[PDB]
Design a binder for these strands. Structure first.
Ligand SMILES: [Zn+2]
Length: 251
DNA sequence: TAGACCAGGAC
DNA sequence: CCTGGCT
């Protein structure tokens, strides 16, 4: 899931678990548990805690309990559902939190790429995987000034800058390409080559793009006509990822 | 800072 | 070979 989807999950999952008390935690693929390393410790510490909240940080979900925070990354295929303890589990269910009311929070992940870290709440933000995460794209903390300051300090591409989680939190490939298109900037441009007016336009489109999705011009459209100028959208490789852009609209 | 690395299986 | 985030 991308940031906007994770936010949707955060928003809808919360009412379904808030105020529920954990009675058991069952783990069927321990490698998903990253901290504590020992999955039995992970399971033992959660038992008895009540769910008090659910926040999002980039693409990470942060379940807030009484004493601990559970940091969860879905990666590709991770998904959460709330259902009855009386019904059979669906396939690829790897972690289940059982509540005292007979309902369960189930984690499914065909890829088994997702991760879970538990820490005392007060230290979750200074530990992996949250420790170095950049500001929320939709928050005041992520401003043109902040982007500009990171821009003029690096030699790498503007796309690579935007994909850097330390620069801005959870800005996916899709939204990087779309935002660059809307800002009229080639993904291959050196971040330092961007003008004050460009970084400002980029910031504005970043916020608008992710903001609209939370509440496609180029991504996956290669071969197809640009929606603004009719030029065939191109796809190459930039900073490891597939990169989509209009050779005419973007400079 | 550029890749390499890696979670696990898919075709 | 697909993909976000240690050498
Ligand atoms: Zn165009």
């Amino acid at each position: 899931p991308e940031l906007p989807e994770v936010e949707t999950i955060r928003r809808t999952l919360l009412p379904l678990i808030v105020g529920k008390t954990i009675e058991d935690v069952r783990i069927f693929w321990p490698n998903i548990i990253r901290h504590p390393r020992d999955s039995e410790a992970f399971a033992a510490r959660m038992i008895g805690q009540t769910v008090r909240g659910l926040e999002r940080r980039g693409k990470f979900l942060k379940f807030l309990l009484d004493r601990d925070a559970l940091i969860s990354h879905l990666r590709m295929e991770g998904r959460y559902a709330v259902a009855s303890a009386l019904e059979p589990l669906e396939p690829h269910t790897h972690v289940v939190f059982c509540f005292t009311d007979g309902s369960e929070l189930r984690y499914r992940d065909v890829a088994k790429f997702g991760t879970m870290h538990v820490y005392a709440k007060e230290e979750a933000d200074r530990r992996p995987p949250l420790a170095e995460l950049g500001p929320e794209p939709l928050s005041p903390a992520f401003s043109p000034a902040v982007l500009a300051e990171r821009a003029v300090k690096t030699k790498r591409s503007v796309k690579a800058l935007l994909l850097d989680c330390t620069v801005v939190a959870g800005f996916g490939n899709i939204y990087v390409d779309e935002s660059l298109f809307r800002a009229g900037i080639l993904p291959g441009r050196p971040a330092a080559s961007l003008s004050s007016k460009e970084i400002e336009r980029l910031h504005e489109e970043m916020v608008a793009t992710i903001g609209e999705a939370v509440m496609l011009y180029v991504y996956g459209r290669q071969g197809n006509p640009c929606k603004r100028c009719g030029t065939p959208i191109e796809k190459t490789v930039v900073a490891g990822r597939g990169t989509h852009y209009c050779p005419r609209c973007q400079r």
